[PDB]
Amino acid sequence: LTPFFWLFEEREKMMEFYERVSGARMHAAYIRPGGVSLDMPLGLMDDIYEFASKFAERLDEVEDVLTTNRIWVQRTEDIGIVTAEEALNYGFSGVMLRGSGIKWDLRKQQPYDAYNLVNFDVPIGTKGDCYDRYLCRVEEMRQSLRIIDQCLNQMPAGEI
Amino acid sequence: ALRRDVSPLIQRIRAFLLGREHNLALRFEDGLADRTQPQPEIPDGPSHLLSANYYCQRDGRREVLPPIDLVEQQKQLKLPTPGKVYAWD
Amino acid sequence: IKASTGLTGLAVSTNPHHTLSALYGKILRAVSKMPQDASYRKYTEQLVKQRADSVAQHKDITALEKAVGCGQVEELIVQAENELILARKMLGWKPWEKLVQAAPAKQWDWPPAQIMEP
Amino acid sequence: LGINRLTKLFQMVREAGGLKQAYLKLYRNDDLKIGTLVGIDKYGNKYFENPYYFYGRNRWIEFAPHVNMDYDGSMIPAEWYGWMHYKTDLPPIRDGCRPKYKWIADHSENLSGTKEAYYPYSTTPNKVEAWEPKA
Amino acid sequence: EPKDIVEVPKGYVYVNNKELSMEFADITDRAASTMFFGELLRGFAVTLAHIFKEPATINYPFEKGPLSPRFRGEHALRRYPSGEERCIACKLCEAICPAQAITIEAEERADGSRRTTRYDIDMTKCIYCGFCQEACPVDAIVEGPNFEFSTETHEELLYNKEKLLCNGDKWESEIASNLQADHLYR
Amino acid sequence: RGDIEKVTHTGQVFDKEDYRNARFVNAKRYVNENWGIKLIEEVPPKECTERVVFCDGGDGPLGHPKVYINLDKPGNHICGYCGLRFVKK
Amino acid sequence: DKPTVRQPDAVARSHLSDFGRYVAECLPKYVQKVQLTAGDELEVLIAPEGVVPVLQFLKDHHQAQFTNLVDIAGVDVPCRKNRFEVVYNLLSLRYNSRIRVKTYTDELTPLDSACEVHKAANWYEREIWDMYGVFFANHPDLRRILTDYGFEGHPQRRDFPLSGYVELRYDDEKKRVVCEPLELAQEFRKFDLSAPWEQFPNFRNANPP
Amino acid sequence: QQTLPVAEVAQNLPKKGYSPFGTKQSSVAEWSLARLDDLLNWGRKGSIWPLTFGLACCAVEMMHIAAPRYDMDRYGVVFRASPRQADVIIVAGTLTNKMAPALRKVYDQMPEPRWVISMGSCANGGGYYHYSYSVVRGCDRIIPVDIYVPGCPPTAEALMYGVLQLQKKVKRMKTLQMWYRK
Amino acid sequence: PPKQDLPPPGGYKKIPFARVPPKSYFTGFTTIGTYVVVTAVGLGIYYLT
Ligand code: SF4
Ligand code: SF4
Ligand code: SF4
Ligand SMILES: [Zn+2]
């Protein structure tokens, strides 16, 4: 229980940010064909900065608690091995695929948004377990964080 | 005198127990932005340029074509590969 | 020797040259049975022979990997095996022949449901 | 132990009005805190802010006393609603730039499950007229 | 650090290439960890510690919030500074309403003005998307900030124009504040 | 009760023998107390000099779209949107 | 000098274009047409019989190596004698490119199954079978997926009312939920959003018979 | 429509009492039965146990309420998984035809006094999918709804406000006091 | 002053995205040896008890 609750504390901060821009907790309509529906309120940049500032602490607290824990490790590790070939022929993708070993990802290969202007590395596993898949998700959180660093630092002015 | 914190003793033990130097998580008015802000002006766009700005010579929806038939394209006129080989390995 | 293939299930395979050579031989014969005027044939020989000619010059497996590109040997053998099945099925399919069916008029026309001038 | 914390308890407990006036406040609000009278509501409510706490606790309300324990979420009036949500940083006492029109009603609770409840009804006078035999 | 097990190029990070050493100090470390549950002790002390962080529960309904000026909640039909109804029955709000939760019937009031007779919203079909207010050309209808509008009976949710006007009257001050905040920005 | 007697400005009262009255035996029939027709009537008709005036009703982008109203006719001229009234004389 | 208008990847258009001709001249009996949609994707229009051969050809041959089968998208178009159209949108990790295969069929004739080619498709065929009624031959188990049990008709067809024919409630006489003929509190109000003025000349006479 | 009293009116008025019944009871039996109802309602009001049905999209808010920002066990609310031990059911998300018999079955397997909160528009009136061939238009057509929490989804504050409103309904329920008349 | 959301002067300090373990108080040798020492003293005290 404790991991879920500690993280759902921080989920509240992020939803508040969605609320700040769009006006809805979830289910914004903020992204629209001609770009985003609306501009951003001033200062939301800074609040994002402190939130990102603290998120490393929060994520590490749960990470140190739960990644190494024997019960969790044995409870997930070597569960449902997903071999590489079997993964492809079944039409997988995402961190599942990326965990099984395939070095594929849509951001790096078929970039669609400003990801051209951000440098970062995806995580990859080599065991195809639920555990190393879980690790891949955890490292993805960390890597996304630096992506916010790049973008939020370089944000240009202009129309929206 | 700035943020409601547990008394200094419990703070020190708390830092000890965690094993990392602790930084506060609750959000205070001081910590977060000036919560009432001046009115923003959104800078005018580049197509709002006032002249030489014809829609006909910058529009996309009227620019797209129907799909072309490649065989018939040739009839009008290095083993080929869909794209740069990726070492998905 | 490389410790791991980096992928689950895909194990490190020794004698890759022997396996690759053997696979290339069989597929070449498999296309041999094909008719001489089949585009599938025309290209498979040149592609496979290019591969099966690159197989030799680079005794080092890593050197061969760079020379052939297209991925690592462990997957590469699987690519070859796939094509073996393709040729056996291809011979059984006779796809070099001409059109089985002509699409009905207005089949592949978009947008639909619009009157026309005769 | 009591590192200038029992002192703070003495402030809130004593100046509340004694054992009775600390317990009833605690008994009703399930917590006792210290702030400053931001502004007295038109309807007996009293608003308190203190930057010592954080955003959840920054601002709070002591509902009107005559509401014994029937406090409700809707008791906040319109002019104070925005401040209470950290939606406007301008206390209504301070910004007189908001409209002061006449037709504005006075506040009301979620009048539901009671004879005062709203209930919908058609807002179009009938469509087709029936022929009248007398005329 | 132990060496890797698969050599990695850039643009990637393998999260398991690190080797589990067989050095005696390394095995005895792991053995001692299992024999005395050091890792559990680390996690155990964490939760003890994290008692000593102050909980972040808002004492609702006394303490409450925060929201933002754009919050989409109770609907309201505003009135001009004179008190006249802003809505002119242009019917765009209905035409855009994704849920088709809006029904409108308009005629001429005796003065000859274009105004609604029936104006209905079903907040059991509305999605509080705000497309209606983004479309209305005179800011007639707005997603007022109230969100505690909870009813014991389903019928009580189908608002008609009388209910909507009442909310506008009730909430006019706050709605005025938000629009002054966002009109030039929206 | 008066609640189920009042005439909605739209002009509806349930007939005295109409079963749809029943729905209010236990709930109020909300009827608004401000009738736009009366209010705009009270507002006096503004007057100007120029043949053609302009109204936005409200203010800036907080009102209705800017509209130009000619006043050469003898009578009043009602703003289409806001119902404001103009008279040149 | 038109920042609003995007500029596709031209070199990608080059490769897909030449490769598309490769496919056409390698599978003459099946490939009916190969076109390059302006969105840079590549479409391969085949006759119903060659479904598996095309897919098997693609997933296997070196130059294709299109392993992943993203989905089986079903399209319905009355006024086409055999209307129900199918789309097999594939990916190729080796070359980092996407391809689309398309075929047609009526509401009666069956259709080849991709279960034997890509294990990924198994559920999709079940989905189209439920949603349109396009039978699939050799499919292992053609059980319905989405619609509830004992559901009659396949709703995604365009000759099927939006709200369906029946709707459920609960009975006290029978302590059970019963399906009843439709009855709507407010009939779904369409809006007739038809353009009177042709906003697109380029597609007017192009693609004529 | 009514409105709150003004400052001076509040000054005249006394305490609003605690038991919503009041303290005007005539005889010993009346006064005694008033207290026992108050105790019963107090028990059923303070401790209420949702079932966590939570089909969809709305469910995320149904979890955020459990989250530590608007703490709900603070009020005495706990998520018992087993419907035999759950006292309240927060139906949240859409009710498709496949689900309709399931919801019915879960509802009546729960023992009473059972109260249902219809959270979200999808449950209230079918929400955004109202004209769909597969959705139960509302959940009023399967079960007796008690409290409606409008929203899509309702902000967590709105949800637990409704919970308090259910507590008020649980507070004013008259069972012993009015059995005496029965 | 600002008219639109932009980063402040000097940009922003890099966000930390690096794992960091805590103090590693003991090692296999230290832990076990200390355990046996405690047990040995415990045996003696029980003897005297
Ligand atoms: S969009 Fe505004 S003015 Fe037009 S009908 Fe709707 S509420 Fe009235
Ligand atoms: S918020 Fe969206 S769904 Fe609700 S009435 Fe407005 S337009 Fe319709
Ligand atoms: S009512 Fe809104 S939040 Fe709830 S399930 Fe439906 S769409 Fe999602
Ligand atoms: Zn006007």
DSSP string spanning G55-110?
HHHHHHSTTT---EEEEEEEE--TTSSS--EEEEEEEETTTTEEEEEEEE--SSS-
Instruction: Measure CB to CB from residue I32 to each of E25, E30, E32 and give the nearest one.
Output: E32
| Token reading at B40 | 């923003």
Q: How many beta-carbon pairs under 8 angstroms link A with G?
A: 22
- Asked if residues C23 and C84 have their Cβ atoms less than 8 Å apart, the reply is yes
Task: Say how far apart CA H25 and CA H27 lie, in whole Å.
Answer: 6
Distance E101 CA to ligand 2 centre (A): 7
Owner of token pair 């765009």: E92
Looking at residue F22, the DSSP 8-state letter turns out to be: G
Task: Say how far apart CA E46 and CA E25 lie, in whole Å.
Answer: 26
Vertex B19, ends B13 and B21: CA angle to 5°? 80
| Token reading at D52 | 């010592």
Instruction: Measure CB to CB from residue G12 to each of B65, B73, B83 and give the nearest one.
Output: B83
Torsion of the alpha carbons at G150, G156, G157 and G160, rounded to the nearest 10? 60
Q: Is B59 left (phi over 0), alpha (psi -120 to 50) or beta?
A: beta
- Asked if residues E87 and E116 have their Cβ atoms less than 8 Å apart, the reply is yes
- Asked if residues I4 and B43 have their Cβ atoms less than 8 Å apart, the reply is yes
Looking at residue C96, the DSSP 8-state letter turns out to be: T
Give the DSSP H or E segment for C19: helix C16-32
Burial class (CB in 10 A: 0-12, 13-18, 19+), G162: exposed
Q: How many beta-carbon pairs under 8 angstroms link B with C?
A: 12
Give F-chain residues touching D115 at CB under 8 angstroms. 26-28
Give B-chain residues touching E42 at CB under 8 angstroms. 19
Top mutation candidate among E77, E132, E136 for ligand 2, by most atoms within 8 Å of CB: E132
* Edge-to-edge strands, sheet with G68-75: B68-69, G31-36, G42-46, G97-104, G85-92, G68-75
Task: Say how far apart CA B5 and CA B10 lie, in whole Å.
Answer: 9
By DSSP bridging, strand F85-87 and strand F46-47 are: parallel
Residue nearest to atom 4 of ligand 2 (CA): E126
Task: Say how far apart CA G148 and CA G150 lie, in whole Å.
Answer: 6
Task: Say how far apart CA E52 and CA B17 lie, in whole Å.
Answer: 10
Question: CB-based contacts of G139: which residues, under 8 Å, 6+ apart?
Answer: G113, G115, G122, G125, G126, G129
Task: Say how far apart CA E32 and CA D91 lie, in whole Å.
Answer: 61
Closest CA of chain A from H54, distance in Å: 16
- Asked if residues E38 and H48 have their Cβ atoms less than 8 Å apart, the reply is no
Task: Say how far apart CA A6 and CA E51 lie, in whole Å.
Answer: 12
Do chains B and H meet with 3 or more Cβ pairs nearer than 8 Å? Answer: no
Strand partners, G121: none
Give the DSSP H or E segment for H172: helix H156-172
Tell me how far the alpha carbon of residue G37 is from its chain's centroid: 16
Task: Kindly provide the b/e burial profile for residues E25-62, where b requires at least 16 CB atoms within 10 angstroms of the residue's own CB.
Answer: eeebbeebbeeeebbeebbebbeebbebbeebbbbbbb
Could you tell me which chains touch chain G, where touching means 3 or more CB pairs under 8 A? Answer: A, B, C, E, H
Task: Say how far apart CA A140 and CA C63 lie, in whole Å.
Answer: 34
The CATH number covering residue E104 comes to 3.30.70.3270
Looking at residue B1, the DSSP 8-state letter turns out to be: -
Q: Is I16 part of the contact surface with chain A (CB cutoff 8 Å)?
A: yes
Q: Which atom of ligand 1 is nearest to the CA of E91?
A: 5
Subunit contact A126:E56, Cβ cutoff 8 A = no
Q: Which atom of ligand 2 is nearest to the CA of H128?
A: 3
Pick the CATH number of H45-172 from 3.20.20.70, 3.40.50.12280, 3.40.309.10, 1.10.630.10: 3.40.50.12280
* Edge-to-edge strands, sheet with H88-92: H88-92, H115-119, H147-149
By DSSP bridging, strand E12-14 and strand H88-92 are: unpaired
By DSSP bridging, strand D59-62 and strand E12-14 are: unpaired
Distance F85 CA to ligand 4 centre (A): 8
Task: Say how far apart CA G131 and CA G142 lie, in whole Å.
Answer: 12
Could you tell me which chains touch chain E, where touching means 3 or more CB pairs under 8 A? Answer: A, B, C, D, F, G, H, I
Instruction: Measure CB to CB from residue E124 to each of H70, H125, H157 and give the nearest one.
Output: H125
Task: Say how far apart CA G20 and CA B52 lie, in whole Å.
Answer: 41
Tell me how far the alpha carbon of residue F68 is from its chain's centroid: 20
Tell me how far the alpha carbon of residue G146 is from its chain's centroid: 17
Subunit contact F29:D124, Cβ cutoff 8 A = no
Distance F36 CA to ligand 4 centre (A): 14
Owner of token pair 């060496």: E3
The strand ranges marked E within chain H are: 88-92, 115-119, 147-149
Do you know the residue count of chain C? 118
Backbone angles phi, psi at E148, to 5 degrees: -85, 75
Half-sphere CA count of F15, side-chain side, radius 13 A: 5
- The letter for the amino acid at G155 is P
Task: Say how far apart CA E51 and CA C52 lie, in whole Å.
Answer: 68
- The letter for the amino acid at C7 is L
Task: Say how far apart CA A146 and CA A135 lie, in whole Å.
Answer: 17
User: Reduced to 3 states, what is the DSSP secondary structure of residue F44?
Assistant: coil
Segments making up each domain of chain H, as ranges: 45-172
Instruction: Measure CB to CB from residue G120 to each of A91, A102, A109 and give the nearest one.
Output: A91
Considering only CA atoms, give the Rg of chain G.
21
Do you know the residue count of chain A? 160
Instruction: Measure CB to CB from residue H128 to each of E57, E64, E127 and give the nearest one.
Output: E127
DSSP string, chain A: -HHHHHHHHHHHHHHHHHHHHHSSSS----EETTEESS-PPTTHHHHHHHHHHHHHHHHHHHHHHHTS-HHHHHHHTT-S---HHHHHHTT--HHHHHHHT----HHHHS--SGGGG----EEE-SS-SHHHHHHHHHHHHHHHHHHHHHHHHH---S--
Query: Does the C-beta of H56 come closer than 6 Å to ligand 3?
Result: yes
Q: After which residues is chain E broken (C to N over 2.5 A)?
A: none
Could you tell me which chains touch chain H, where touching means 3 or more CB pairs under 8 A? Answer: A, D, E, G
Identify the CA nearest to G169 among candidates G158, G180, G159.
G180
Identify the CA nearest to G107 among candidates G137, G129, G140, G139.
G129
Taking the CB of residue F55, how many other CB atoms lie within 10 A of it? Answer: 23
Give B-chain residues touching E185 at CB under 8 angstroms. 39-40, 42
Subunit contact H100:G147, Cβ cutoff 8 A = no
Task: Say how far apart CA B60 and CA G5 lie, in whole Å.
Answer: 5
| Token reading at B14 | 């708390």
Strand partners, F36: none
Owner of token pair 């907080």: F62
- Asked if residues G163 and H132 have their Cβ atoms less than 8 Å apart, the reply is yes
Burial class (CB in 10 A: 0-12, 13-18, 19+), B52: exposed
Instruction: Measure CB to CB from residue F27 to each of D103, D119, D125 and give the nearest one.
Output: D119
Do chains G and D meet with 3 or more Cβ pairs nearer than 8 Å? Answer: no
Task: Say how far apart CA C49 and CA C71 lie, in whole Å.
Answer: 18
Backbone angles phi, psi at G31, to 5 degrees: -60, 115
Give the DSSP H or E segment for E122: strand E114-122
Helices (H), H20-118: 28-46, 58-64, 100-109
* Edge-to-edge strands, sheet with E102-108: E102-108, E114-122, E158-159
Subunit contact D104:E81, Cβ cutoff 8 A = no
Do you know the residue count of chain D? 135
- The letter for the amino acid at E62 is F
Task: Say how far apart CA E19 and CA A73 lie, in whole Å.
Answer: 17
Torsion of the alpha carbons at G148, G153, G159 and G162, rounded to the nearest 10? -20
- The letter for the amino acid at G113 is S
Q: Is I32 part of the contact surface with chain E (CB cutoff 8 Å)?
A: yes
Axis crossing angle, helix H28-46 with helix H156-172, rounded to the nearest 10: 160
Domain span at E174: 76-183
Pocket of ligand 1 (CB under 6 A): E 87-93, 104, 135-136, 138, 140-141
Give the C-alpha distances (Å, rounded to integers) separating D49 from B31, B33, C115, D21, D56. 16, 18, 72, 20, 11
Task: Say how far apart CA H176 and CA I17 lie, in whole Å.
Answer: 62
Return the residue in B65, B86, B89 with the most chain C beta carbons within 10 A, the one to mutate for interface testing: B89
Burial class (CB in 10 A: 0-12, 13-18, 19+), H18: middle
Give the C-alpha distances (Å, rounded to integers) separating I6 from A42, A64, C4. 8, 35, 47
Considering only the C-alpha atoms of chain I, give the largest distance between any 2 of them, rounded to a whole number of Å: 82
Looking at residue E143, the DSSP 8-state letter turns out to be: E
* F82 is annotated as contributing to ligand binding: yes
| Token reading at A72 | 């969790």
Give the C-alpha distances (Å, rounded to integers) separating H108 from H89, H101, H105. 11, 11, 6
Question: CB-based contacts of C17: which residues, under 8 Å, 6+ apart?
Answer: C55, C56, C59, C61, C64
Q: Is H68 part of the contact surface with chain D (CB cutoff 8 Å)?
A: no
Burial class (CB in 10 A: 0-12, 13-18, 19+), G62: buried
Do you know the residue count of chain G? 209
- Asked if residues H161 and H128 have their Cβ atoms less than 8 Å apart, the reply is no
Taking the CB of residue B65, how many other CB atoms lie within 10 A of it? Answer: 10
- Asked if residues H53 and H95 have their Cβ atoms less than 8 Å apart, the reply is no
Backbone angles phi, psi at H96, to 5 degrees: -80, 165
Give the DSSP H or E segment for E106: strand E102-108
Q: Is E28 part of the contact surface with chain G (CB cutoff 8 Å)?
A: no
Burial class (CB in 10 A: 0-12, 13-18, 19+), H26: exposed
Give the C-alpha distances (Å, rounded to integers) separating A103 from A84, C8, E17, F13, H76. 11, 13, 14, 72, 49
- The letter for the amino acid at I1 is P
| Token reading at G46 | 């085949």
DSSP string, E9-76: -SSEEESS-S-----HHHHHHHHHHHHHTHHHHHHHHHHHHHHTS------TTTS-----TT---SEE
Half-sphere CA count of B11, side-chain side, radius 13 A: 10
Task: Say how far apart CA D4 and CA G66 lie, in whole Å.
Answer: 73
Q: Is D66 part of the contact surface with chain H (CB cutoff 8 Å)?
A: yes
Task: Say how far apart CA G53 and CA G112 lie, in whole Å.
Answer: 10
Taking the CB of residue G123, how many other CB atoms lie within 10 A of it? Answer: 14
Task: Kindly provide the b/e burial profile for residues A85-112, where b requires at least 16 CB atoms within 10 angstroms of the residue's own CB.
Answer: eebbbbbbbebebbbbbbbbbeeeeeee
Task: Say how far apart CA F67 and CA F82 lie, in whole Å.
Answer: 10
Give B-chain residues touching A44 at CB under 8 angstroms. 33
Q: Is H165 part of the contact surface with chain D (CB cutoff 8 Å)?
A: yes
Task: Say how far apart CA I5 and CA I7 lie, in whole Å.
Answer: 7
Task: Say how far apart CA A29 and CA E132 lie, in whole Å.
Answer: 13
Return the residue in G7, G25, G36 with the most chain B beta carbons within 10 A, the one to mutate for interface testing: G36
Give the C-alpha distances (Å, rounded to integers) separating E142 from E126, E176, H80, H127, H148. 13, 11, 39, 20, 22
- The letter for the amino acid at D53 is Y
| Token reading at E54 | 């102050």
Task: Say how far apart CA G54 and CA G58 lie, in whole Å.
Answer: 6
Torsion of the alpha carbons at A92, A95, A100 and A104, rounded to the nearest 10? 80
Q: Which of residues 50-109 of H touch E (CB under 8 A)?
A: 68-71, 74
* F79 is annotated as contributing to ligand binding: yes
Subunit contact E185:A41, Cβ cutoff 8 A = yes
Q: Is the peptide bond before E61 cis (omega within 30 degrees of 0)?
A: yes
Vertex G75, ends G73 and G79: CA angle to 5°? 165
| Token reading at H13 | 């008025």
Tell me how far the alpha carbon of residue E170 is from its chain's centroid: 22
Subunit contact E82:F58, Cβ cutoff 8 A = no
Task: Say how far apart CA I42 and CA I49 lie, in whole Å.
Answer: 10
Helices (H), chain F: 36-42
Owner of token pair 């024919």: G165
